[PDB]
Amino acid sequence: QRMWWAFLASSMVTFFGGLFIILLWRTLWMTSVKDWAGVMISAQTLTGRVLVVLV
Numbered sequence: 001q002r003m004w005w006a007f008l009a010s011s012m013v014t015f016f017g018g019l020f021i022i023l024l025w026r027t028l029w030m031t032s033v034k035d036w037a038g039v040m041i042s043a044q045t046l047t048g049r050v051l052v053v054l055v
Contacts, residue, residue: 042048 039045040047040051
């Protein structure tokens, strides 16, 4: 009657299985949006400063 294992295992699989699939992929128009996300999250951007203050 104690379902804590679900809450723990969710974080466990999110941390581990995704890391494993990233490792597997490594062993094997997106640039514009990537740079756009980078320029929001940049420290020099005022929007980035406001966003980190809010978070």
